[PDB]
Design a protein around this ligand. Structure first.
Ligand SMILES: OC[C@H]1O[C@@H](O[C@@H]2[C@@H](O)[C@H](O)O[C@H](CO)[C@H]2O)[C@H](O)[C@@H](O)[C@@H]1O
Ligand code: CL
Length: 248
């Protein structure tokens, strides 16, 4: 049907995911970096499939002891694992043993931890390569999960092609991508959507970020500094932004 998803933050109570779901089927998924249902203005997900995410090894709001319980209650078809462990002081071996213990048991589609686009040893795809070696085939997974932030569509295209060249038998989900602050976000996503839509090895992609600029600044001011406000899919009024209009 389509590959587009909403990267839906915890602070999004005021907003309606259904605004970006016009029935044509391009937008199919939503995740909220947690294992509880997306906070929304309707209480529901606007007809999108929620993907559970165990983004840290354990937290108050997503206790890992409740991960199997939540998947069973909510009936997710897919689950995401750790968010950027490659820059959060989690070794590939630690992630492999944690994944085997906690994520393996969910008999659904599963993604390995979202890694950053760093080229440094022990980060990014180097980290992911070490985690797959530490797994030694004992991790069950369907997808590798990528983040990308950078300065041009050309650089993004080169990064996705690099990932595929290095992992050619693997399926990719992109859980966060945008330009860093300054660039034309509309031009970037106008280029990125048709590029990713044509790649049979990319199953899902989620622009950072399905919120409004006012909510981004009020709750994630660090992200405004890094990325700016141009990649927000919503206007402050809670309709589609210029980038949101590209989701339909
Ligand atoms: O993610 C890979 C595949 O995992 C499957 O669940 C696994 C069971 O089939 C397997 O025998 O048990 C393991 C370890 O408990 C489960 O992860 C999913 O059912 C598949 O959908 C998925 O493609
Ligand atoms: Cl990145």
């Amino acid at each position: 049907s389509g590959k587009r998803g909403l990267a839906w933050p915890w602070y999004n109570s005021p907003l309606d995911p259904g605004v970006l779901n016009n029935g044509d089927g391009e937008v199919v998924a939503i995740y909220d970096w947690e294992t509880y249902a997306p906070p929304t203005s309707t209480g529901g997900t606007g007809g999108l499939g929620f993907i559970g995410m165990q983004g840290t090894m354990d937290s108050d709001s997503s206790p890992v002891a409740q991960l199997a319980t939540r998947q069973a209650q909510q009936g997710w078809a897919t689950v995401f694992s750790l968010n950027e462990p490659d820059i959060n002081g989690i070794t590939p071996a630690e992630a492999a043993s944690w994944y085997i213990e906690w994520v393996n048991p969910l008999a659904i589609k599963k993604a390995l931890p979202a890694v950053t686009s760093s080229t440094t040893s022990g980060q990014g795809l180097s980290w992911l390569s070490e985690m797959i070696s530490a797994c030694a085939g004992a991790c069950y997974f369907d997808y590798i999960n990528l983040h990308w932030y950078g300065t041009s569509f050309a650089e993004f295209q080169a990064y996705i092609e690099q990932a595929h060249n290095q992992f050619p038998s693997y399926t990719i989900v992109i859980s966060e991508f945008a330009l860093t602050n300054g660039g034309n976000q509309v031009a970037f996503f106008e280029s990125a959507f048709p590029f990713l839509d044509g790649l049979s090895y990319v199953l899902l992609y989620f622009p950072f970020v399905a919120t409004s600029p006012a909510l981004l600044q009020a709750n994630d001011p660090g992200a405004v500094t890094t990325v700016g406000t141009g990649s927000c899919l919503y206007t402050n009024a809670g309709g589609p932004s210029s980038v949101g209009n590209l989701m339909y």
